[PDB]
């Protein structure tokens, strides 16, 4: 289980550009894109597993609250169809799984932004090179 | 708990472009994007925690008003199903949590706009460089 | 309490483009976006406070009309459930708060349009620059 | 009280594009957007005032027809709950206010379409510029 | 007016020898149909108001026998006319997209 | 059935640029694009087959839960129309097929990013060549 | 019906650059673009015919399941409006036509990528030529 703050610090380090090694950064920029692309794809792989758990968790707990069988356990609060969306989204089991799924979703949205930065950093490097050539004439 | 006005002043400072250091701003523009991207992602992390509280807070207070048990406390006003949406959204506990969640939502929408500005500032810098080359 | 007409005149001034200082406007366009983004975000902060008042105001006056207690005051008109939506939306206290909330909503929708103009003004400036380069060849 | 036909003629004039001054129209297109955005926002400000009147007008006349007090005046037709929606929507006071509110609603929907045209006119201008560059090669 | 003229008007505008003048006239066609769409809505507002008062008249039968049926009939006519203008506004919006497609189809 | 981690390691190897053979990498960059383009297209071919299974799997299990016939088998839980979307998305057969489809979807989105990297790597190589000419 | 793997192998062959005949490849690169442009356009011509069949196939089978068919066949499962999208997308006739249409869609998306490679290969050749002049 990786942390968000670990990715934040990692991105802040990778995004930095070395002005002295502009030729190095140009080839390394495409390398950084591959690293986060691996992270982004791996996160979706994790979310697919969690979403599968959430889908089952909902149906399982839906049976519980709606009076059906969820492991020989039954809800006695007798919730109506209108009250259902509120109760399920607040269930201890459901909320635990969903919170997990949504967290990796934030990590995924971060990697999407990370790739956006790298894709624009590669343009930034090429732009800087054009600025150096501008001083040359 | 960070404030909105603190982000407003921070963005207004970062968005400013130094005409003398155009090469510096080009590399720094991508740096600013990473800073707000960290803020944006961290806010969602906070909202996920608050939303979880709100989800439970609703179900807890729903039991209270609907005659069910919420810590051996019961509502005696006997609200109907039609009146429910109005009462819950005005509950002291619910409104307190929701207001918190919605506030960070404004902060999140601000960071989304901040990233939009930076993404266009990087284009603005490159455009200015093309204007200098035009002369 | 800011006025709408004050924002209308402010936007009309900011949106104007100086043809002589195209390089200046390009960097200033991103600056204007930040100004209205601060306004837009601040308005939502205000609306969140007002909406909170409205939510309570409704529940408070709902008790009043439905025969429940609203500060030892009771409605004697005996309104039915069907008549309720009409009466509450016309209550002096409710209508005062809602009108306030809806007003800032118009201001918010104006800032959203203002940001849309600035976002397209930045494209307009870049387009004009491309038109000047077109005359060059 | 502005008229619809006045806005129709105003829009038809603004939407026209000068082929000789393409650079001028590009900067002026963003200016026209600000003009109608001020109109659109101002109309909503007017509707908010009228809607407030309508909300009260309904509740006031609701008391009248339902046997309650509306300025020491009472309806003797004894309308039932089923007949209420038809009677209120045809009341002289209510219909007068609603007609006003709905009219500015048409003006508002026109400004929304006007902004849509301007937003696409800015794309039309940029497209035309790309067509001129196409003949250049 | 007539529905017939509306079909001949739209089918004639939807259609190259002067591409720069056709792209600048695409927003012009929009204004011509925008003023038309809002004018239909204007005439119906008067009709919809007369229908309400006529609906109360039919209700006061307990308190021409079908006056509102003469109003609702003409009201259902403009509804068709209003739905044919919404397609036009949806067409010109797609015509500008089809006009931008040609300039992209010529460079491809 | 190919793995994601196998593509991750493969991309990380291909994306690397040899500074000594810049002329070689320029012609090889367009070659790498063709390789992943073949992968990307082949994955869509696989997904089209799986999606077809999923479409049938849904309709088959929909009959089961809604009281209709799914191979002489019937659901007795009597689920309502509101409960349907939740139950179907959690069915053992459906979830198995969907998980498969979504997985190749991740592989497909990875190839799309891989092609994006190669398309920008070709620009990176040309940029580096322009930087070497700048020193000249 | 052409195969995807046949196009994959064909592209992999065309994309290769001969370093000895750089002048030849420069003129041939524009030739390859025309070849795939003919393929791309021809595929759309095929898809237009298939899409027309799909449009009719849907409306035909829609009548069947909804009971509004003037034909001899009627569906007795009595599907509701909510269940309709799932049933139609899983119909034997519909799924057969759609699968065909989607397949050529993959071929079309491949040709679009092929043209992208050729368009960048022409830049790759010119870049390599500039690299040879750099050594000069």
mmCIF file of C-alpha atoms in Angstrom, chain A residues 4-5 8 11-12 15 17 77-79 83 89-90 95 98-99 102-103 106 109-110 113-114 117 124 127 131-132 134, chain B residues 22-23 26-27 30-31 33-34 37-38 41-42 44-45 48 52 55-56 58-59 62-63 66 68 125-126 129 132-133:
data_model
loop_
_atom_site.group_PDB
_atom_site.id
_atom_site.type_symbol
_atom_site.label_atom_id
_atom_site.label_comp_id
_atom_site.label_asym_id
_atom_site.label_seq_id
_atom_site.Cartn_x
_atom_site.Cartn_y
_atom_site.Cartn_z
ATOM 1 C CA UNK A 4 0.092 9.773 -1.713
ATOM 2 C CA UNK A 5 2.729 11.927 -0.027
ATOM 3 C CA UNK A 8 4.052 13.906 -4.260
ATOM 4 C CA UNK A 11 7.095 13.858 -8.633
ATOM 5 C CA UNK A 12 8.545 17.077 -7.207
ATOM 6 C CA UNK A 15 9.970 17.384 -12.490
ATOM 7 C CA UNK A 17 15.131 20.367 -14.684
ATOM 8 C CA UNK A 77 -34.475 -1.751 11.001
ATOM 9 C CA UNK A 78 -36.718 -2.483 8.005
ATOM 10 C CA UNK A 79 -35.337 0.146 5.640
ATOM 11 C CA UNK A 83 -33.694 4.981 2.564
ATOM 12 C CA UNK A 89 -23.203 4.026 1.512
ATOM 13 C CA UNK A 90 -22.721 4.189 5.285
ATOM 14 C CA UNK A 95 -17.559 2.248 3.394
ATOM 15 C CA UNK A 98 -15.188 2.179 -1.099
ATOM 16 C CA UNK A 99 -12.771 4.390 0.850
ATOM 17 C CA UNK A 102 -11.567 6.037 -3.870
ATOM 18 C CA UNK A 103 -8.095 6.492 -2.370
ATOM 19 C CA UNK A 106 -6.877 9.868 -6.053
ATOM 20 C CA UNK A 109 -5.743 11.016 -10.816
ATOM 21 C CA UNK A 110 -2.362 12.123 -9.491
ATOM 22 C CA UNK A 113 -1.545 14.774 -13.696
ATOM 23 C CA UNK A 114 2.037 13.577 -13.353
ATOM 24 C CA UNK A 117 3.435 17.479 -16.359
ATOM 25 C CA UNK A 124 9.476 22.915 -21.783
ATOM 26 C CA UNK A 127 11.403 25.398 -25.655
ATOM 27 C CA UNK A 131 15.595 30.036 -26.276
ATOM 28 C CA UNK A 132 19.306 29.251 -26.034
ATOM 29 C CA UNK A 134 17.690 32.495 -29.902
ATOM 30 C CA UNK B 22 11.842 33.772 -19.460
ATOM 31 C CA UNK B 23 14.084 30.694 -19.576
ATOM 32 C CA UNK B 26 9.630 28.002 -18.530
ATOM 33 C CA UNK B 27 11.218 25.374 -16.285
ATOM 34 C CA UNK B 30 6.203 22.911 -14.746
ATOM 35 C CA UNK B 31 7.388 23.080 -11.138
ATOM 36 C CA UNK B 33 2.078 22.615 -11.667
ATOM 37 C CA UNK B 34 3.543 19.901 -9.444
ATOM 38 C CA UNK B 37 -1.099 18.977 -8.144
ATOM 39 C CA UNK B 38 0.136 17.910 -4.711
ATOM 40 C CA UNK B 41 -4.512 15.413 -4.587
ATOM 41 C CA UNK B 42 -4.097 16.064 -0.858
ATOM 42 C CA UNK B 44 -9.214 14.878 -2.257
ATOM 43 C CA UNK B 45 -7.533 12.749 0.409
ATOM 44 C CA UNK B 48 -12.542 11.254 1.226
ATOM 45 C CA UNK B 52 -16.927 8.984 4.988
ATOM 46 C CA UNK B 55 -22.128 9.144 4.968
ATOM 47 C CA UNK B 56 -22.208 7.745 8.511
ATOM 48 C CA UNK B 58 -26.549 10.853 7.603
ATOM 49 C CA UNK B 59 -27.386 7.220 8.371
ATOM 50 C CA UNK B 62 -31.623 9.162 9.721
ATOM 51 C CA UNK B 63 -32.240 6.540 12.393
ATOM 52 C CA UNK B 66 -37.192 8.060 11.542
ATOM 53 C CA UNK B 68 -35.017 4.216 15.041
ATOM 54 C CA UNK B 125 5.469 31.764 -21.883
ATOM 55 C CA UNK B 126 6.107 29.842 -25.110
ATOM 56 C CA UNK B 129 9.096 33.621 -26.666
ATOM 57 C CA UNK B 132 10.332 37.905 -29.181
ATOM 58 C CA UNK B 133 11.560 35.790 -32.092
#
